[PDB]
């Protein structure tokens, strides 16, 4: 039914530069809208639409696991078509087309904590430079799409665009138009996988250049796992639990869709504080003027006609933006620390020390944060105070917790192995005579992510094999699949084009022991396994289906090998 959304008033946040909309006329015209809007969204404002056109498994990994596909689909979460435009628009309306809560009483306290963190980072680490070309080359996804506004340049993917060097002039053109107040290439494209939003490739490279340094501060933070591999997370979870004794690990449903323009105004305020010069601050501020006023093209289908629909929102966070992870991590830390401080009655004059202590992993409160994922660690007495009322503050901000009633008290976790962080739990695994906590999740999810993405298909599989060996060797079916992947993929591929210490053809256990025990242990035989008794549930039961797959893996490896040079890794196991 034909709806005309009325947005609430905007928050006015003292001490912060407002994120005024840009002049979008040029960027809107670049999308070549044809018809006036239908208006069937409740929050997003439709500007117009045009007639469009309806928008596999890696062969190496996929064939290696094929004998297991049945048990993985039945007993695990492997789960294996393109989403129709009808379904795309239905999931946009269900999940994205929801107004953020702009108006609440928490901005002054949130600002205080953003300011404290910014002053701490500046005091200890200095201000933030734009990324260098070399840093940008390390961070790009070479397989990223170009965007409708860039499709008629025929680059294929980001990697080809990057190699051509043409982006150098385009990024400067993007910058100048943006700073004029009338950007080019500022309308988001979307694809369905959830719905991924992304600016054109030139805009994405500019974002990375300006805001990509935020990751460097996060690497210094004891509440962040930025730059650290998954094999380190369990020990961090254990260390945090040992100093506290109780954990609260709650997810927000659709975190990205709930971030307000008010929260974005705070992010911008903080990041301009960090910028290296005044022009950079203006660039960051102008990027956030774009972010807080997102325009995007989403598909739909009515009466058999496929539409490309131009929609305008307010606030929210787009997923296909490289700085998003770092900005999400910071805002998740601040909103969580704020709600905890207010709920526990920590006086505001102690908030600078509180944020320093969280950052230094000192005291008996700890956080671990990655994107929208967080675990809060507290002593039992404070955990009970937190669990019974901190949700009121996040509810006030629209940060509603997933899969629980609105005012349900938080579950207090007291067993380190029940803490979920970054979609894993962590179990103690023996390396020689020491213990390290290593990640586990449903093996169907592990295998699916290793399977669903030329010589880059082979290089991609090989990197999945190296990653699986490093992170999941303690799960027997994962170590086995990893060794099979490394036996069927050829030596000499460019893995770095596709995670530096171990991205090598000559990877050996000494590299893995260096990452986990700093080389106190050695050899294949000191790489631990989970106990046989626990090989069930999320892990593959070691029955005849597993054993037959293992039996036929050497033959399958020989059949999948082609003209390359290979080594036999399956003999490293049994
Ligand atoms: Mg969590």
Author numbering: 303 to 357, 363 to 387, 391 to 503, 519 to 778, 785 to 829, 836 to 911
Excerpt from the paper describing this PDB structure:
Jingmenviruses are a category of emerging segmented viruses that have garnered global attention in recent years, and are close relatives of the flaviviruses in the Flaviviridae family. One of their genome segments encodes NSP1 homologous to flavivirus NS5. NSP1 comprises both the methyltransferase (MTase) and RNA-dependent RNA polymerase (RdRP) modules playing essential roles in viral genome replication and capping. The NSP1 RdRP exhibits a characteristic architectural feature commonly found in viral RdRPs, known as encircled right-hand architecture.
To gain insights into the structural characteristics of jingmenvirus NSP1, we conducted a crystallization screening experiment for three variants: FL (residues 1–915) JMTV NSP1, as well as two N-terminal truncation constructs, namely D55 (residues 56–915) and D307 (residues 308–915). Although the FL construct did not yield any crystals, the D55 and D307 constructs produced crystals with flake-like and stick-like shapes, respectively. The initial determination of the structure of D55 involved the utilization of the SAD method, wherein Se-Met-substituted D55 crystals were employed. Subsequently, the structures of native D55 and D307 were resolved through molecular replacement, utilizing the Se-Met-derived D55 structure as the search model. The D55 crystal was found to be an N-terminal degraded D55 protein, but the precise N-terminus of the protein in the crystal was not determined. However, electron density was not detected for residues 56–302 in both the native and Set-Met-derived D55 structures. All three structures are isomorphous with the same P212121 space group cell dimensions. Each crystallographic asymmetric unit consists of a single NSP1 monomer. Due to the significant similarity between the native structures of D55 and D307, with a root-mean-square deviation (RMSD) value of merely 0.2 Å for all superimposable α-carbon atoms (with D307 structure as the reference, covering 99.5% of residues), we primarily utilize the 1.84-Å D307 structure for subsequent illustrations.
